Amino acid sequence: PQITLWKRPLVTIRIGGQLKEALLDTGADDTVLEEMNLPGKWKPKMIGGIGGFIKVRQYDQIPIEICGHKAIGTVLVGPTPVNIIGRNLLTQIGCTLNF
Amino acid sequence: PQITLWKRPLVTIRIGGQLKEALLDTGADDTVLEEMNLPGKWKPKMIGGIGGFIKVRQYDQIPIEICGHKAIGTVLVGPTPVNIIGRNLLTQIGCTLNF
Numbered sequence: 376p377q378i379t380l381w382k383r384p385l386v387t388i389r390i391g392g393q394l395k396e397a398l399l400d401t402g403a404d405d406t407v408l409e410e411m412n413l414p415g416k417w418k419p420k421m422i423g424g425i426g427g428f429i430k431v432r433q434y435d436q437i438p439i440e441i442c443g444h445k446a447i448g449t450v451l452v453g454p455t456p457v458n459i460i461g462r463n464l465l466t467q468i469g470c471t472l473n474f
Numbered sequence: 475p476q477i478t479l480w481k482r483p484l485v486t487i488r489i490g491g492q493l494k495e496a497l498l499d500t501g502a503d504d505t506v507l508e509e510m511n512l513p514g515k516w517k518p519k520m521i522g523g524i525g526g527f528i529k530v531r532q533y534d535q536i537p538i539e540i541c542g543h544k545a546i547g548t549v550l551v552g553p554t555p556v557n558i559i560g561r562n563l564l565t566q567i568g569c570t571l572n573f
């Protein structure tokens with residue numbers, strides 16, 4: 376699809392049989408979801424943004440379907456203000472910016 | 475232009491006699507610029523992201539040129555690590571997400 380930006384580009388993602396709303400975030404290097412359970416091993420990681428750094432759990436090679444498009448990649452889980460789809464998965468679904 | 479997301483979507487912007495590099499950021503509601511001593515009236519604001527909140531100065535009706543596309547609107551100025559072009563100006567230059 377083509378998504379304009381007068382509203383937040385929120386979309387429905389599917390991850391582990393669960394539907395969630397997430398923000399398509401071109402200013403985010405990585406994908407970070409609010410606290411949830413995911414299966415498998417994780418690694419502690421720290422990521423930073425405008426307000427400083429947080430601790431997250433890094434899960435690798437996780438399937439997520441984003442607005443019907445398949446990605447499999449790294450998903451961080453932690454105290455993000457909102458669920459964020461970052462460039463690591465936006466590239467997988469063929470997302471570009473256009474003007 | 476079409477901008478892929480393999481790397482950070484940095485572009486050149488001009489605000490007065492400072493050309494700057496800034497992120498085209500679909501996850502940003504507002505435009506947030508690194509500290510600069512802009513003229514005119516402003517209002518204090520707090521904005522939240524990963525890690526918490528920062529204090530910024532809200533300037534209104536500031537002209538900004540983004541890759542030769544003219545925009546004019548609200549610009550927040552504060553201790554952000556990166557210049558961020560948010561949706562308030564992305565809409566003005568006709569920017570969409572496409573996949």
Ligand SMILES: CC[C@H](C)CN(C[C@@H](O)[C@H](Cc1ccccc1)NC(=O)[C@H](CC(C)C)NC(C)=O)S(=O)(=O)c1ccc2ncsc2c1
Nearest residue numbers: 402403404405422423424425501502503504521522523524
């Ligand atoms: C709440 C939704 C988001 C968090 C709002 N922000 C925009 C976001 O794209 C930022 C941009 C960024 C990049 C590098 C360094 C710092 C920031 N990315 C990030 O914080 C990402 C996070 C990833 C690590 C997952 N950081 C990096 C290094 O990519 S935000 O920058 O915090 C932001 C921007 C505008 C705005 N207007 C009103 S509230 C508000 C919040």
